[PDB]
Design a protein around this nucleic acid. Structure first.
Lengths: 168, 164
RNA sequence: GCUUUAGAGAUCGUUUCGAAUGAUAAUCGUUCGAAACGUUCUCCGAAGC
């Protein structure tokens, strides 16, 4: 496992998160990063250095884990190393149900938009409705595939609502 | 360019760095994120918030930058809305004379979560009229490039076209 | 301009953990966090030519 994943997983129990602070300190060409981390209820602050902040974060993390090992809060063995009230929060989950219920094994096709450093997507899906002998389809943009797939599913649920194939 | 990179690229102009402080707010059925941001020496605190961290910091930046324009440090139009180390360096100038505009052709192989890249490049050298080629791989395109570039160069230091 | 090297920020993919919304397995998904391996762009200290 990863040390920083592990500490977040230790706090996740208590609905809190580790609170990191960080400050750079060196010559601007061999610069060094100083990192501290707190977690409530504890007063102790775990510190770590490195030439980059990702690593400084983890050295700090392992030192906070050392402290909870050292004050016996952890054992050494557990440690490693509204169109009918359908919208974006609700449409994708809803269309999923429809998809499962009518064994519509097809899935969203994505196409990339824009450059790699500013990538977005289109999500495309078509559902055939044998009852009405008729296909609804959508191609909607989104900042990522997940986002795109929901606005796609939103377009599809709305059209299917407007055909009394779906409730609200 | 996004609002927070902007704030950083405006701070690099002084070798100073923004400083963020993030905190959660609401309970399990409705939890939110509060982000505060400071740029020394300015006393101003930028404040943003939202359902997720990234958007909470972008809001905190946008607020801070909105401050900097009000106080005259920025202007609204400025804001948005033979080895692998020397192998590459030596090959690019061998390529530089012969106006060879051909570049590395990369090919991603393996699972997306553990890529490897094939790098290929061929040079129709005219000294002999063999056309020399390299096909090497790395776990990222720069590594693949260098190993590719290195194969090439070693295949000419051994055919006496490159002083070692 | 090219190379080597210490960095920073953004972008997206795939993968993987965690937190949250009678039962066994299977399968698709929603919100938040964290990690792995990578792509792309911008910023940038130093060194060589």
């Amino acid at each position: 496992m990863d040390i920083k994943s592990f500490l977040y997983q230790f706090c996740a129990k208590s609905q809190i998160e580790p609170k990191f602070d960080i400050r750079q300190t060196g010559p601007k060409n061999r610069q060094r990063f100083l990192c501290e981390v707190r977690v409530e209820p504890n007063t102790y602050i775990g510190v770590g250095n490195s030439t980059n902040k990702k690593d400084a974060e983890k050295n700090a993390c392992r030192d906070f884990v050392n402290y909870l090992v050292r004050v016996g809060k952890l054992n050494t063995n557990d440690v490693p190393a509204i169109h009918g009230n359908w919208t974006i929060e609700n449409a994708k989950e809803r269309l999923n149900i429809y998809k499962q219920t009518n064994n519509i094994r097809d899935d969203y096709k994505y196409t990339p938009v824009g450059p790699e450093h500013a990538r977005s997507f289109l999500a495309e899906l078509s559902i055939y409705v044998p009852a009405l002998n008729r296909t609804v389809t959508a191609r909607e943009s989104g900042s990522n595939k997940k986002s795109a797939s929901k606005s796609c599913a939103l377009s599809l649920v709305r059209q299917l609502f407007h055909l009394n194939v779906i409730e609200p």
